[PDB]
Amino acid sequence: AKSARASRIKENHQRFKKNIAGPVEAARLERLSAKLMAIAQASGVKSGKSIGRKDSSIVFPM
Amino acid sequence: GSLAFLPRKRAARHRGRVKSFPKDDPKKPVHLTAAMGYKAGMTTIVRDLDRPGAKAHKKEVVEAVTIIDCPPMVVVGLVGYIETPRGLRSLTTVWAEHLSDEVKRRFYKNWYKSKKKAFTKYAKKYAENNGASITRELERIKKYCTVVRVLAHTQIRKTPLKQKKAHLMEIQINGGSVADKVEFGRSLFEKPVTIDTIFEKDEMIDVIAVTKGHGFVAGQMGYHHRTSVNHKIYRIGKGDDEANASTETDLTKKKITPMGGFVRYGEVNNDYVMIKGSVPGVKKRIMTLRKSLFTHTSRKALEKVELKWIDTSSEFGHGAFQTAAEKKQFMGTLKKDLQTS
Amino acid sequence: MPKRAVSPAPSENEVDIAGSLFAGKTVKKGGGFQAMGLDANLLRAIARKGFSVPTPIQRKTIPLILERRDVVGMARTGSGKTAAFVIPMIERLKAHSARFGARALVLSPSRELALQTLKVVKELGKGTDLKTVLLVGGDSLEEQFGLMATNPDIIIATPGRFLHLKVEMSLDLSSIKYVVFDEADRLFEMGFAAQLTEILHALPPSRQTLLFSATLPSSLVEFTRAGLQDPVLVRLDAETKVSPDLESAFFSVKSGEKEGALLHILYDIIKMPLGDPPKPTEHSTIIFTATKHHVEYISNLLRLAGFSVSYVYGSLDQTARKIQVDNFRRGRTNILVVTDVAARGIDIPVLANVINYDFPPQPKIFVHRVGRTARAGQRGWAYALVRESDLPYLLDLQLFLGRRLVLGREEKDPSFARDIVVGSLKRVELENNVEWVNKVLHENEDIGALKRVTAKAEKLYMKTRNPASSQSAKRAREVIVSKGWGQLHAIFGEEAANEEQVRDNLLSKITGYKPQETIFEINKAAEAVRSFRQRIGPRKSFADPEVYMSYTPRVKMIRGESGVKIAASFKSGRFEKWRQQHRLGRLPQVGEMEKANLVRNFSLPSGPRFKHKQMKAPKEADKWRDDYEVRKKRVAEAKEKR
Amino acid sequence: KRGAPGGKLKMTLGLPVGAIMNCADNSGARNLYIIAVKGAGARLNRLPAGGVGDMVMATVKKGKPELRKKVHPAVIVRQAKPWKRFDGVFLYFEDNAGVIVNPKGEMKGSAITGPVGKEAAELWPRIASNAGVVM
Amino acid sequence: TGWKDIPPVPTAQEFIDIVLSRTQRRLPTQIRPGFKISRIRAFYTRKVKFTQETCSEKFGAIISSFPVLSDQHPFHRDLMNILYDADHFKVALGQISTAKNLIETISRDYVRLLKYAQSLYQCKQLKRAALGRMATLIKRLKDPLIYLDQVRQHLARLPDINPTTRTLLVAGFPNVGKSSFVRSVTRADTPVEPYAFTTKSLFVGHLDYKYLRYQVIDTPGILDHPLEEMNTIEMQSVTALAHLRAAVLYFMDISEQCGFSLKAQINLFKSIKPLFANKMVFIVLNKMDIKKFEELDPEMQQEINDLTKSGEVEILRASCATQEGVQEVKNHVCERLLVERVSQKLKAGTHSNGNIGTRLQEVMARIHVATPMDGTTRETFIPEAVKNLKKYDKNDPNRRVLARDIEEANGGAGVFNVDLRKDWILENPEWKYDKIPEIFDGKNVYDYIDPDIDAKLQALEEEEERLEKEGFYDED
RNA sequence: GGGAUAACUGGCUUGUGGCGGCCAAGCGUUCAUAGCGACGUCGCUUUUUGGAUGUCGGCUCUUCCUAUCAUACCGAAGCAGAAUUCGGUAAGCGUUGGAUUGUUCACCCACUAAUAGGGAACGUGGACCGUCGUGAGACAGGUUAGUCCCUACUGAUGAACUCGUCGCAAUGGUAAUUCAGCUUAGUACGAGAGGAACCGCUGAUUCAGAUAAUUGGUUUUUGCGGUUGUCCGACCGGGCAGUGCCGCGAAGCUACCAUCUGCUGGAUAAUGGCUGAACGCCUCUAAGUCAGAAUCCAUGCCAG
RNA sequence: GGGAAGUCGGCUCCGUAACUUGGUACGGACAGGGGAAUCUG
């Protein structure tokens, strides 16, 4: 028989993933993302916009 | 045995790790990937099979399914990861106000003795006009991080175990710019997300758990970390329907949980995911449900599933009654109910 | 799995007559039993049976047996050999012996033929007080211990069980004075040779041994040469004389037309009727073959042909053999298909025609086959399908019978009964009935599966057949070259010979053509074809009759009942268990008196030995069952009966 | 073609090798004795077994003497060990039975007594045509 | 059946490499002199013995596979004598049989030599002698191996002729009509180019006639030589004419368009007619389109009619070009041979005994048609719409679309989902594709369905009202 | 009776015989003739009609080699199709019996995809002497010869680095196999008999990992019911038959006796090419370079 | 106890009548039992 890691079996699987199971997972994922959206929508050093420091084994200790 | 699973090693942690989340591209929209639940038991179904080419085409087939009780999660944090030449690493983590008592219990081991002091100074950081630090925390995520995850925890107050601790994990957000998934995760803060939004009916998922341990009759037999792939979801229940187990060709108003309750679990009064076949783990155990890493190459996926009936009869013995009303009507009226009335 | 799992059951019939290398107030030679002087009780018991005249195999033997000479006996079945060896016991014995120990040992190969000698003994031994026990397989090995304690004087036994008794009992075997090995060629065929050797060593040196048989295989010859002392060969009269009333005909057929050739002989040569016939029948043709797989083809093809045919082979069932040899004997069927071993077992009546589907390897086997027919003055026929590979066995048949061989139409009127006449069949009607064979072969799968089995069965038989002599092999090449091999046979008439002659005189020039150029000449291969033809092209009473010295004349391992290879001398422990199961004392030695106790402790039953003895109590009564009260006392009655 | 039945869903095999099974057709045989279950896997110490619908090699041990001590292929039509069906019926028969059949799938018998398993009738159409009760 | 299943036979060199590489690759090759001499001897004996068995199983394969001449039909052993010299054929197979007998003799002698050997050098030299001696025996056998390879290719590339069946045989002089007639009646690859012998071998085709299979054999052609001498091409023709039972068809060119004289064509018939005396013959005067039977002078008609004065020869006329006679020359010949064969078949069964066989009883039963005694016929309910219904033609452009064509548009055998409700008939279409209730409150819905349930339920309403007025549910 | 080697092999072994003749490049005593001498060819074995095996085993299991039986891929063959045959890359994955035998192989028969061969210091579970004999022989004649430690690894723990939560992943192991049915299709191909394959679809064997709804099995829940025999003078209630016997049974554990699951990218080998020098033709190779095996390396998986 | 294995397994005497102490004809008996079950009224 042909192996599960055969190149021909992989190419047949790649055509299934692109043409048959492709848009079906895309349409389902669109509906799930719309549901997560409904749940979700239901100075720089003083405002925090500019990123500063909070609160060494890469260089030798001088 | 198999050398891929040897030596026989106990799982380092009782929960279970996702290890590999699916590969992300920004073209799809934002969606979460993993979820928990707690296993309640198993039951039987009958499915009108819709498989072209099989002998069981267009005839009834009995099928063993599992029931995982999933109360809604609560998003409490957002961790962001940066891509280093030593692997991914967590750059910073942002939490939310008003962490519940159950998620605070996870940080403790003696809750009864310890005064409730975890995240007390962090909550003041939100509210005492140091929200610049929280916005600096989120802006650092938006600028440097390549993937973000959601710290989400389940509520075992509604799940009927004796455990008051909660269970945390990281749930990866995929599908968008790193800026877009930040506003996604920040908006989810202090909010309950449901399993109806995480997965949907007729999709094939992976289950991560620790197996049953065979202690007390050459080494460790059982309690192994297993992830098992390609399990088909047959039904997402909503809990408040009062007809969770009712199908289109069985108009009986009944819930999923059997008569007398699930053995050593109780009644499933929340959202439940009904999955094909067996699942690693035991009753009352935490079950991590995860999306498929790769696009499916099977016709078992893309297969719509319709159900004829769900077995609501008792698993504490041989029972052939689905409801209490059916048992009473068949057995007639008895002398204890005659004396009570 | 069993496609020749062990071996073909009909193996071969080794035969030998090199067993000649063993050696007015006055009733004048009446040839009756009274002329031999038997017992007065015994001679009326013969008259009870109905043996008015002794059969010739008796008439030779029972003289010599009383004079106490060891007799090896050639005798076909149905000749009354069975009576021929027991009437010297009822003469020798005349009374039951008070001393312990049987004095007659009868060795039988099979269980059923043991009962045949059993039924003879009481039928010929009424009036006297002799004791007979049978020791066969399948009977209990606790009953057979007790029947020894009943102290017989004739023990009839299969050698597998008798040795198993002997090693278990440690019986002093010396009390027996006369041993008979009936059907010893059957004995060696089933694999009793090693157990016969251990029995023979344990038999006393003072004994009278005979051995009655249908044939003498070469392995049997060495057994008597080491076993019997001063043996004398007794043969049934003119067994080796082919009866001069028999007309023989041998037909040259190819291997692919052998089935259609058998259909020619039945249809147009014998003119056998179709269907069941409305004491044998008038046509009554036997068919001889080689293997049981050839039996199944030949039988099942003739059912599809429509002829009434019965069949017997080697490993055929006990009941299945009786019904088919019954059907042939009473004339309900026309064809009997035997290999050779089924032939020599079953009793053959007066027979009219004999067909040899496969030519016998030894020329003496052919004699045995034609000895079954054309006897007692009635005319007979015997046809055989000879082949090219079976040709040297035919020229060896010439040298044994000493007859002249004719090839097709070398003589105008060949003598069928005296000269060997070979030839070919009718061409036209052979191609019709081989068309039918190929049509049936392509049509039905079951006959086609029987062809493939008998094809590979034949291929084994070809390899293990005893090869012909070199002079017969060389002289076969010449008659193949000779022009008479393919000519029409002499039976079909002189009128058939003319239009065959006017055609084949021209046709034979087509067959004798030599191509001057093979088609590959018509390259390196073309130079190769030229290379062979250059290399392999064709290459350019004075003696007195009185004295002329002519170069021509004139731990031992056995097989147990379990089928596992057991060491020969194994004392299992059953007699030891037997000897405290009833707590018997020491057994008698040879010579001491019987105990009137020991005979009545282990006597015989009333006589009908049913095979069913399972006594069980019924199951316990269930108080919710339908037949509760009926079950209740029958369980209690079982406790009362116990 | 090798005699391997195609497109059947496997059940609990309840007739191992060296098992005496009844004979259902009117061929004269009253008993069959399994020596080979073809299509079985090659495993050490694992006795080959077959269920209802599997075609096996058998030897006649009881019956008419013309058909005694012969080897024919046969199809198992009833078995006593319980087995699954795809609709959820756990079920079993009263005896173990089979019908003498040719390698193509045509039975030598003319009629079948007793019931016939549903799997054997689906796999072999000639047994289905000669069946009286398909249960 | 055929001789295609003869295994390919290698040359002497390819025999040597196959045998010697089999010995090296499929057995161990490592032995050291420090080992025991018993296992050194056991190593080298196994190598010599293994080489012989592969030689014997290969020399036995060629002997067994090739057909033995004295087991075939007289057609086949004569055809295989002409095609390959049968004198040359059994000495090629005979040489390979005595070559295998010598190889075992080499192997039997050298295992005895090895058993008494005393060093690893001695065992090494003894094996090389044995493997070398078998090598030089095969290398001498080079010449017959090429012959047996070439006769194997041509045997597998030979038409299947079965002498038993009904056969139409087409013979005659060269360049008359043979290849055109066989092509016209039977689809069979037979060349048609116009020169002396285009066909050099027998060509076989098959035809049907009243649902019975007939085979037709085309042959090269025969010249006027008196069969003492002919080449291998025309000796193939007369072998099929002499050994195969057939209603032969002697094609004769009335015109001289073959370039060969018409009087010579009659002289071939009178020479080969003794091989035709038993069978039935038909002479086809082919090519009347260019020369008709009335155009030649009356002298040749008389001797043509004299051929008909022999009772087994018929005059039939046909012309392959324009097919002016081929169908009725086909229908005539197979009809006459069919009624001949049925005459022999009724004789074979009505032979002078008085008893009919069981095969005759089975076949008269098939021909007998049972008819009811009263002779009435039952009424047939064939619908009126099916008589004018148009037959389905797959090449017709305007086709009714089948379920196969619906399947291929919507997938394949394992993709298409059949809709078993689209063929449902109901009162109104939207009731279809509906989920049908099955269980309700622990009972089967189906057992509770009947028409007039509404009126039956009113009896439940009225009788309940009766028992409520009767007070039969009162507590005391 | 005296003398002599302490003992064998350790770049050993495998596929192509020996003898004599002819031919023969070179080298040489001074030159192809003092002579050594391969590849071939000739003569012998060897030609014109088609059984062999002594002590051993037998089974499981681990690991390795390839000198490959099957399964994947290619090159060639009158290879039409089907089935094959020879060769090459390949050790990923699998690898039987029966008859017969002292035992094996050969052969034969059956099954299977096939039921290859080997390695693992050839893996882990007598020895004289004495006595009597001497044409040969012995001895109820003798005495004597002659082997419980340390540690690697695995699992479960574990001191210290403040406790706890969520993670990353260096490194190590790594997993899936084989067959069938439907469609293609009675189609290509074929004179006939026969008769494929790709894509798609559905099962099954082996192997691995799980699980207990349902169906069997099991009953320190000693749960319910029936029953045998004993004693306490009798009832009650007990000792009793180291858990009496008989039915049914929950829970739990189980079952190749039940059910579920087993996933994808890149680089290659044999080989097939593209452009194109060497070499004014030509060439798949030299510089560049496309495809391609169950192979390699990783992901998926396990440990951390 | 069961399954497996191997087999070839399961499918004449009493009384009565004439004849020479022994034979001959007639009448009667032998050449079954147990266990498990189903369907039917």
Ligand SMILES: Nc1nc2c(ncn2[C@@H]2O[C@H](COP(=O)(O)OP(=O)(O)OP(=O)(O)O)[C@@H](O)[C@H]2O)c(=O)[nH]1
């Ligand atoms: N006019 C005419 N010519 C014919 C006819 N039949 C055959 N031919 C000629 O014959 C040629 C066909 O080959 P045939 O002669 O039939 O074949 P053949 O008889 O086996 O002889 P070969 O030519 O060797 O094959 C054609 O080229 C025609 O020219 C016919 O009926 N009418």
